[PDB]
Motif scaffolding. Structure first.
Motif: not given
Ligand SMILES: OC[C@H]1O[C@H](O[C@H]2[C@H](O)[C@@H](O)[C@@H](O)O[C@@H]2CO)[C@H](O)[C@@H](O)[C@@H]1O
Length: 377
Positions: A131, A135, A205, A208-211
């Motif tokens: 994650p 980013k 996740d 869901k966190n756009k990874h």
């Protein structure tokens, strides 16, 4: 039929190299060898062999061959001691079912973490770094990781890391109070437990966190990585040839840890079975023993698409220096050799739905695996 060999092998394997071995067979014997790569081959062969048809030889990971054999779709393999001694004993064990050799072990497949050395000169050690690492690449217009989220094979290493298991064995009913006390049930499915839930929860996740995106399939992931769009992928040795032809400088390394635990890939032995309905079982043996499972035959397939760690000891000794084969075998050693029992097919179908459902949001991880657990057994 007779006087020819028809061979089925999956489209991601070195089917043009195997056609070359087939041409070498034709040149020596006059017998035409056609190699075909039908879609959903593992599904089509039991459909078409059960009626007495399909190919003379079928290539797949060994996990599917117990079902084929139990339905009478596979001939028994007849290697002498001297020919068996040429392959690793554990490769023979994967194609042993109810005590019978039911296929020829070809090569050992395990997923590894493939990374782009110019985007990521040092790959991450753990899943929990991805994650923060995705980013950071998003500020360079790239992403950290894409792999096929539509096949449970690819997500199982994470699921298995902290607790998921599948030590499937058919075992008799143990209930004093059933009317019928003679039937068997599948024990050893472990997907509705704390470890598996944590594994698949981490995957949801990321989505869901756009990874990652829940619709990413084999093709999307492969193109993105070989186009320099994502910094890492998860795939097997067969995928190496397309990256070689791409301009990506790639490394192949150990899968990342999850909660300090090694990722545990399901290991496959690519296996060559002889159809129980085939009228050329002796030609199949000829081709398998004296043309494919030679250095020259496996070399033709391996440089078309890498086989991985080959079952033939003589040729594996040459490939063992390859650090990608070191990564393959090191991942394979953290993971487990797949069971080969017939319920394996139902286990894969159960886990596929749970993964797709949890990732897309149709079910929670909790529901998805509770359903997966019941269906698998
Ligand atoms: O995802 C379920 C699927 O996983 C394995 O399939 C692998 C196969 O072993 C490899 O040779 C390669 O082609 O990737 C496949 C996944 O797409 C199992 O062998 C298979 O039975 C199972 O359904």
């Amino acid at each position: 039929e007779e006087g020819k060999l028809v061979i089925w092998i999956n489209g991601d394997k070195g089917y043009n190299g195997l056609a070359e071995v087939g041409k070498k067979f034709e040149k020596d014997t006059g017998i035409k060898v056609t190699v075909e790569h039908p879609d959903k081959l593992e599904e089509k062969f039991p459909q078409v062999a059960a009626t007495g048809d399909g190919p003379d030889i079928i290539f797949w990971a060994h996990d599917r061959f117990g079902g084929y054999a139990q339905s009478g779709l596979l001939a028994e393999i007849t290697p002498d001691k001297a020919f068996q001694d040429k392959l690793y004993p554990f490769t023979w064990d994967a194609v042993r079912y109810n005590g019978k050799l039911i296929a020829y072990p070809i090569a050992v497949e395990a997923l590894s973490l493939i990374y782009n050395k110019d985007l990521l000169p040092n790959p991450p050690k753990t899943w929990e770094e991805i994650p923060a690492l995705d980013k950071e690449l998003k500020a360079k217009g790239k992403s950290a990781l894409m792999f096929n989220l539509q096949e449970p094979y690819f997500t199982w290493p994470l699921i298995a890391a902290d607790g998921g298991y599948a030590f499937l064995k058919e075992k008799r009913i143990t209930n004093t109070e059933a009317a019928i006390d003679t039937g068997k049930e599948t024990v050893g499915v472990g997907v509705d437990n704390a470890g598996a839930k944590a594994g698949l929860t981490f995957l949801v996740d990321l989505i869901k966190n756009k990874h990652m995106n829940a619709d990413t399939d084999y093709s999307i992931a492969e193109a993105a990585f070989n186009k320099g769009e994502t910094a890492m992928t998860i795939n097997g040795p067969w995928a190496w040839s397309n990256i070689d032809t791409s301009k990506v400088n790639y490394g192949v390394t150990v899968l990342p840890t999850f909660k300090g635990q090694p990722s545990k890939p399901f290991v496959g032995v690519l296996s060559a079975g002889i159809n129980a309905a085939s009228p050329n079982k002796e030609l199949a043996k000829e081709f398998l023993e004296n043309y494919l499972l030679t250095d020259e035959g496996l070399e033709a397939v391996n440089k078309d698409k890498p086989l991985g760690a080959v079952a033939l000891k003589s040729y594996e000794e040459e490939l063992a220096k390859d650090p990608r084969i070191a990564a393959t075998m090191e991942n394979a050693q953290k993971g487990e050799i797949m069971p080969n029992i017939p319920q394996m097919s139902a286990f894969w179908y159960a886990v596929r739905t749970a993964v797709i459902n949890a990732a897309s949001g149709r079910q929670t991880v909790d529901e998805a695996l509770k359903d997966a657990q019941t269906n698998s057994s």
